[PDB]
Amino acid sequence: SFDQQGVFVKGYAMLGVTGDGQDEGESGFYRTTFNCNELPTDECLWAWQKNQDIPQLTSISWSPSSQRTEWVYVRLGYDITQYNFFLDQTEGMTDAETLRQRAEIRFLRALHYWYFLDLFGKAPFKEHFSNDLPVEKKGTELYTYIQNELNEIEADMYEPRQAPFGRADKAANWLLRARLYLNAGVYTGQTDYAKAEEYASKVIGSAYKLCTNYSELFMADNDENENAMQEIILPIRQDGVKTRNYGGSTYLVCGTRVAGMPRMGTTNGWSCIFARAAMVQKFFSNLEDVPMLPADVEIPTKGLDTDEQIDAFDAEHGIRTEDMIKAAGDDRALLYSGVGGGRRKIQTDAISGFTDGLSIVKWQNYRSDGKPVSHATYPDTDIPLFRLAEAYLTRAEAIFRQGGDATGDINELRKRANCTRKVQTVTEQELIDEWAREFYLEGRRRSDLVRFGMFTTNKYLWDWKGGAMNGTSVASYYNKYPIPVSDINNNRNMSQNEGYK
Ligand SMILES: [Ca+2]
């Protein structure tokens, strides 16, 4: 029989865990969406280019036969079929909890449609669980639908911070709408920054507040530490012993580490992704200012097995991550150029391995309170999918776009990060750079780059963009992923996006 509670729980679980030619957890909502919004950007690089479809995602040169693209497409659609099932099975129910559940499920469905809209510009549309092929709902119509959904369900959702931690409240609703309004120009051709500002303000005016220590937002106890919880509007709950190797944070932590690094937080460093030189430049405009071990200084083959030994050596050469942060004058510069794991490069002439770029240690499987985590390999770290910081950056950009003064909102975030440099005047470049500094490796980069018209164009060239070591542009039709050829062949209702063949 229909287990309403079980299905509801699964609705949320789909955001952070999975149930070939696809490794464990590869079909995950988070990993697939994260990769499509990160791997082709200036924030990071996949170290093993021999992997299928990686060169394509890395260089922005994929085709309709893209495996990675099919993965995210199939996942988004599948999740929605489940949300539709729950809604069809609870239709007519009037009890208080079910009203909240239905609103929340519609919210999650709306979020999924936003991903479709943002990534493909359209989506295989269906509102009920049936065998009928989905119909194509294009950009503007899709945009309008999502905004209507969020508007209609707001009243039945929990007030800000009143829902059980892990569930969406009215503030999550407002934030997503603010994101939609901010990107209204891209999706509909008509901007709506006035509304972006309005809804961003609703979120800022809520009970949510900014965490006083940036790093704590991405630590193992971010579901218990109030300093972090007060800012996390929508957390994707993760638990080492339960989520295990199939979660989103498994990738964020294990994927960015390699044996030898101090405080790995895991016994298994996948050494999958590292920072592109352009990412490091977001904290160091002049890359020569980045703390680095001199080429003439050798790295001992012995005496560097413990974190203590590694830290002492890094300290001697000023390359501990805490030294990186001090040099950057920004708490958010959670990068590693130390000797743990081997000699690092900031930029490379050929993507040959994990050490060809600095490591990103933003995500950690250590608790701010120092207590034990649940597992030696799989992280406990929740993914703060929605953070109050997004409201500040969204409002800043909206105000800037309208000709207003956005210094206040930008400095709210820079002050939180204890930045030595405060912004005196906001510019387009400053804004997109701040989006990177605040949200790097949180799965949204590509979307912001497209809005700023920098994803495919010459307006911004980063290392390895377009397949060129120094970066080169690509066709503008790449601002949208293609509809998987498999669905083109299976659903005659769908049409391929412009440019692809
Ligand atoms: Ca957790």
UniProtKB/Swiss-Prot annotation:
<dbReference type="GO" id="GO:0019867">
    <property type="term" value="C:outer membrane"/>
</dbReference>
<feature type="binding site">
    <location>
        <position position="380"/>
    </location>
    <ligand>
        <name>Ca(2+)</name>
    </ligand>
</feature>
<keyword id="KW-0449">Lipoprotein</keyword>
<comment type="similarity">
    <text>Belongs to the SusD family.</text>
</comment>
<dbReference type="GO" id="GO:0009279">
    <property type="term" value="C:cell outer membrane"/>
</dbReference>
<keyword id="KW-0472">Membrane</keyword>
<keyword id="KW-0998">Cell outer membrane</keyword>
<feature type="binding site">
    <location>
        <begin position="23"/>
        <end position="25"/>
    </location>
    <ligand>
        <name>D-glucose</name>
    </ligand>
</feature>
<keyword id="KW-0564">Palmitate</keyword>
<dbReference type="InterPro" id="IPR011990">
    <property type="entry name" value="TPR-like_helical_dom_sf"/>
</dbReference>
<feature type="binding site">
    <location>
        <position position="270"/>
    </location>
    <ligand>
        <name>D-glucose</name>
    </ligand>
</feature>
<feature type="binding site">
    <location>
        <position position="382"/>
    </location>
    <ligand>
        <name>Ca(2+)</name>
    </ligand>
</feature>
<dbReference type="GO" id="GO:2001070">
    <property type="term" value="F:starch binding"/>
</dbReference>
<dbReference type="GO" id="GO:0005983">
    <property type="term" value="P:starch catabolic process"/>
</dbReference>
<feature type="binding site">
    <location>
        <position position="31"/>
    </location>
    <ligand>
        <name>D-glucose</name>
    </ligand>
</feature>
<dbReference type="InterPro" id="IPR012944">
    <property type="entry name" value="SusD_RagB_dom"/>
</dbReference>
<dbReference type="Pfam" id="PF07980">
    <property type="entry name" value="SusD_RagB"/>
</dbReference>
<keyword id="KW-0732">Signal</keyword>
<dbReference type="GO" id="GO:0042802">
    <property type="term" value="F:identical protein binding"/>
</dbReference>
<comment type="subunit">
    <text>Interacts with SusC.</text>
</comment>
<comment type="pathway">
    <text>Glycan degradation; starch degradation.</text>
</comment>
<keyword id="KW-0106">Calcium</keyword>
<keyword id="KW-0119">Carbohydrate metabolism</keyword>
<protein>
    <recommendedName>
        <fullName>Starch-binding protein SusD</fullName>
    </recommendedName>
</protein>
<feature type="binding site">
    <location>
        <begin position="48"/>
        <end position="51"/>
    </location>
    <ligand>
        <name>D-glucose</name>
    </ligand>
</feature>
<dbReference type="GO" id="GO:0005982">
    <property type="term" value="P:starch metabolic process"/>
</dbReference>
<comment type="function">
    <text>Major starch-binding protein present at the surface of the cell. Mediates starch-binding before starch transport in the periplasm for degradation.</text>
</comment>
<dbReference type="GO" id="GO:0005509">
    <property type="term" value="F:calcium ion binding"/>
</dbReference>
<feature type="binding site">
    <location>
        <position position="238"/>
    </location>
    <ligand>
        <name>Ca(2+)</name>
    </ligand>
</feature>
<feature type="binding site">
    <location>
        <position position="246"/>
    </location>
    <ligand>
        <name>D-glucose</name>
    </ligand>
</feature>
<keyword id="KW-0479">Metal-binding</keyword>
<feature type="binding site">
    <location>
        <position position="223"/>
    </location>
    <ligand>
        <name>Ca(2+)</name>
    </ligand>
</feature>
